Design a protein around this motif. Structure first.
Motif, PDB file in Angstrom:
ATOM      1  N   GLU A  58       0.820  -1.233   0.000  1.00  0.00           N
ATOM      2  CA  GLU A  58       0.000   0.000   0.000  1.00  0.00           C
ATOM      3  C   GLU A  58       0.857   1.290   0.000  1.00  0.00           C
ATOM      4  O   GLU A  58       0.640   2.179  -0.810  1.00  0.00           O
ATOM      5  CB  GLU A  58      -0.967   0.060   1.189  1.00  0.00           C
ATOM      6  CG  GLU A  58      -1.801   1.337   1.190  1.00  0.00           C
ATOM      7  CD  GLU A  58      -2.939   1.392   2.188  1.00  0.00           C
ATOM      8  OE1 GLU A  58      -3.189   0.409   2.933  1.00  0.00           O
ATOM      9  OE2 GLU A  58      -3.589   2.468   2.243  1.00  0.00           O
ATOM     10  N   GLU A  59       1.826   1.360   0.903  1.00  0.00           N
ATOM     11  CA  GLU A  59       2.608   2.604   1.081  1.00  0.00           C
ATOM     12  C   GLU A  59       3.412   2.909  -0.191  1.00  0.00           C
ATOM     13  O   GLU A  59       3.435   4.035  -0.682  1.00  0.00           O
ATOM     14  CB  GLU A  59       3.556   2.458   2.278  1.00  0.00           C
ATOM     15  CG  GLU A  59       4.517   3.624   2.466  1.00  0.00           C
ATOM     16  CD  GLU A  59       5.452   3.466   3.629  1.00  0.00           C
ATOM     17  OE1 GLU A  59       5.237   2.576   4.494  1.00  0.00           O
ATOM     18  OE2 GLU A  59       6.419   4.253   3.654  1.00  0.00           O
ATOM     19  N   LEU A  60       4.112   1.897  -0.673  1.00  0.00           N
ATOM     20  CA  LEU A  60       4.890   1.991  -1.917  1.00  0.00           C
ATOM     21  C   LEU A  60       4.035   2.403  -3.097  1.00  0.00           C
ATOM     22  O   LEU A  60       4.420   3.297  -3.859  1.00  0.00           O
ATOM     23  CB  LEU A  60       5.611   0.692  -2.213  1.00  0.00           C
ATOM     24  CG  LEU A  60       6.463   0.641  -3.478  1.00  0.00           C
ATOM     25  CD1 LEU A  60       7.582   1.669  -3.436  1.00  0.00           C
ATOM     26  CD2 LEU A  60       7.077  -0.734  -3.635  1.00  0.00           C
ATOM     27  N   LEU A  61       2.861   1.786  -3.237  1.00  0.00           N
ATOM     28  CA  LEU A  61       1.977   2.086  -4.368  1.00  0.00           C
ATOM     29  C   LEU A  61       1.500   3.525  -4.322  1.00  0.00           C
ATOM     30  O   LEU A  61       1.492   4.238  -5.342  1.00  0.00           O
ATOM     31  CB  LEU A  61       0.766   1.149  -4.409  1.00  0.00           C
ATOM     32  CG  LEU A  61       1.067  -0.297  -4.765  1.00  0.00           C
ATOM     33  CD1 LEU A  61      -0.156  -1.142  -4.434  1.00  0.00           C
ATOM     34  CD2 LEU A  61       1.465  -0.424  -6.226  1.00  0.00           C
ATOM     35  N   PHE A  62       1.074   3.972  -3.143  1.00  0.00           N
ATOM     36  CA  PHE A  62       0.521   5.321  -3.021  1.00  0.00           C
ATOM     37  C   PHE A  62       1.593   6.387  -3.266  1.00  0.00           C
ATOM     38  O   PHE A  62       1.361   7.339  -4.004  1.00  0.00           O
ATOM     39  CB  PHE A  62      -0.151   5.524  -1.653  1.00  0.00           C
ATOM     40  CG  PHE A  62      -1.013   6.751  -1.585  1.00  0.00           C
ATOM     41  CD1 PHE A  62      -2.340   6.716  -2.032  1.00  0.00           C
ATOM     42  CD2 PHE A  62      -0.492   7.951  -1.101  1.00  0.00           C
ATOM     43  CE1 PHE A  62      -3.146   7.828  -1.983  1.00  0.00           C
ATOM     44  CE2 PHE A  62      -1.294   9.062  -1.055  1.00  0.00           C
ATOM     45  CZ  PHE A  62      -2.614   9.016  -1.490  1.00  0.00           C
ATOM     46  N   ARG A  63       2.775   6.167  -2.712  1.00  0.00           N
ATOM     47  CA  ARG A  63       3.904   7.067  -2.900  1.00  0.00           C
ATOM     48  C   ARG A  63       4.351   7.090  -4.352  1.00  0.00           C
ATOM     49  O   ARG A  63       4.578   8.159  -4.894  1.00  0.00           O
ATOM     50  CB  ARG A  63       5.099   6.684  -2.028  1.00  0.00           C
ATOM     51  CG  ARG A  63       6.325   7.572  -2.262  1.00  0.00           C
ATOM     52  CD  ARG A  63       7.399   7.352  -1.221  1.00  0.00           C
ATOM     53  NE  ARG A  63       6.944   7.604   0.151  1.00  0.00           N
ATOM     54  CZ  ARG A  63       6.812   6.668   1.109  1.00  0.00           C
ATOM     55  NH1 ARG A  63       7.093   5.388   0.884  1.00  0.00           N
ATOM     56  NH2 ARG A  63       6.403   7.040   2.304  1.00  0.00           N
ATOM     57  N   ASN A  64       4.500   5.918  -4.959  1.00  0.00           N
ATOM     58  CA  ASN A  64       4.937   5.830  -6.345  1.00  0.00           C
ATOM     59  C   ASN A  64       3.985   6.531  -7.268  1.00  0.00           C
ATOM     60  O   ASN A  64       4.426   7.176  -8.214  1.00  0.00           O
ATOM     61  CB  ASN A  64       5.127   4.388  -6.787  1.00  0.00           C
ATOM     62  CG  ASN A  64       6.418   3.777  -6.264  1.00  0.00           C
ATOM     63  OD1 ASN A  64       7.158   4.382  -5.481  1.00  0.00           O
ATOM     64  ND2 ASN A  64       6.680   2.563  -6.679  1.00  0.00           N
ATOM     65  N   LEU A  65       2.691   6.421  -6.998  1.00  0.00           N
ATOM     66  CA  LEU A  65       1.707   7.116  -7.827  1.00  0.00           C
ATOM     67  C   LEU A  65       1.918   8.633  -7.798  1.00  0.00           C
ATOM     68  O   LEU A  65       1.831   9.283  -8.837  1.00  0.00           O
ATOM     69  CB  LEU A  65       0.293   6.732  -7.421  1.00  0.00           C
ATOM     70  CG  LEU A  65      -0.857   7.224  -8.282  1.00  0.00           C
ATOM     71  CD1 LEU A  65      -0.685   6.696  -9.697  1.00  0.00           C
ATOM     72  CD2 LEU A  65      -2.174   6.759  -7.695  1.00  0.00           C
ATOM     73  N   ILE A  66       2.228   9.176  -6.618  1.00  0.00           N
ATOM     74  CA  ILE A  66       2.575  10.596  -6.472  1.00  0.00           C
ATOM     75  C   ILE A  66       3.798  10.916  -7.318  1.00  0.00           C
ATOM     76  O   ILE A  66       3.821  11.967  -7.987  1.00  0.00           O
ATOM     77  CB  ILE A  66       2.790  10.992  -4.999  1.00  0.00           C
ATOM     78  CG1 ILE A  66       1.443  10.906  -4.252  1.00  0.00           C
ATOM     79  CG2 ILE A  66       3.342  12.409  -4.902  1.00  0.00           C
ATOM     80  CD1 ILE A  66       1.570  10.927  -2.758  1.00  0.00           C
TER      81      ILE A  66
END
Ligand SMILES: [Cl-]
Ligand SMILES: [Cl-]
Ligand SMILES: [Cl-]
Ligand SMILES: [Mg+2]
Length: 271
Positions: free
Chosen positions: A231-239
């Motif tokens: 979750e954390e990686l995905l949300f950050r990467n999207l940013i």
């Protein structure tokens, strides 16, 4: 009738080896003039990089750390040569500014400026041509926005997205990039997910925000278990990778006043 947006630092690397030894300002500007004729550019805007991405570094302090490491490990001669190149590129930008609107903003990537220009004024032109070798710029493709790469010689169009990027559309490209990250930018991806699997995941569950909402996903495969933990990686990467969504925020990161000035400048150009 068209808008042309030039990734100017990227163009400078065109002939990096040559452009480090002899001045290239006149050649640089004549290249841009030739491109503008080739692409029927009523308006041409040239962009440059200056400093590091304040926006992306705030989200990921290790962003492009591999590139920084390489610069730090240069020999003294490699460094001098690069300093010579950047002095010549500065001269190229100065000459360019006499002929075309030319922008650098310290702490803002060219990528964010390009994305914002397209949003702001792209509607005023028949077509928008992006001059860059960077695949990341294909997050901007539409029916009326295309890219030309001097290294591959390809003209990149939305209709050919699968050929280029193993996805059918920009929303998918953005989500796939978020899932896979990019070694070259020091952005980690989810282990075990290649382009194929990632495209299949997106077509099943939706974009990365939709994916996050459904975690944990069903499936016994190790790559699904990996995704479920991310979750954390995905949300950050999207940013980090969603240029269209965050380009305004990325410019505003260095000061709302700086964003306001840039907006003002671009709207003046488009009038
Ligand atoms: Cl340097
Ligand atoms: Cl992982
Ligand atoms: Cl795969
Ligand atoms: Mg990138």
């Amino acid at each position: 009738r068209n808008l042309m947006i030039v990734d100017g630092t990227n163009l400078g690397f065109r002939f990096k080896h040559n452009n480090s030894k002899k001045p290239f300002a006149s050649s640089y500007v004549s290249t841009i003039q030739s491109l503008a004729k080739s692409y029927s550019a009523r308006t041409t805007i040239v962009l440059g990089d200056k400093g590091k991405s304040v926006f992306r570094l705030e989200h990921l302090p290790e962003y492009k750390g591999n590139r920084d490491e390489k610069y730090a490990q240069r020999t003294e001669e490699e460094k001098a040569l690069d300093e010579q190149f950047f002095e010549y590129l500065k001269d190229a930008f100065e000459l360019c500014k006499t002929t075309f609107p030319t922008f650098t903003i310290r702490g803002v990537e060219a990528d964010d400026m390009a994305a914002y220009i397209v949003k702001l004024i792209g509607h005023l032109y028949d077509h928008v041509w992006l001059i860059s070798t960077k695949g990341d710029w294909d997050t901007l493709l539409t029916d009326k926005v295309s890219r030309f790469s001097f290294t591959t010689r390809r003209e990149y169009h939305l209709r050919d997205m699968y050929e280029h990027h193993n996805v059918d559309d920009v929303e998918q490209f953005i989500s796939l990039k978020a899932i896979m990250g990019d070694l070259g930018d020091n952005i980690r991806g989810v282990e075990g997910i290649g382009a194929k699997r990632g495209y299949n995941i997106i077509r099943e569950f939706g974009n990365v925000l939709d994916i996050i909402d459904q975690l944990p996903l069903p499936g016994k495969q190790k790559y699904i278990q990996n995704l479920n933990a991310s979750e954390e990686l995905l949300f950050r990467n999207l940013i980090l990778v969603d240029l269209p969504t965050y380009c305004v925020d990325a410019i505003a990161a260095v000061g709302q006043d700086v964003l306001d000035k840039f907006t003002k400048d671009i709207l003046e150009i488009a009038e």
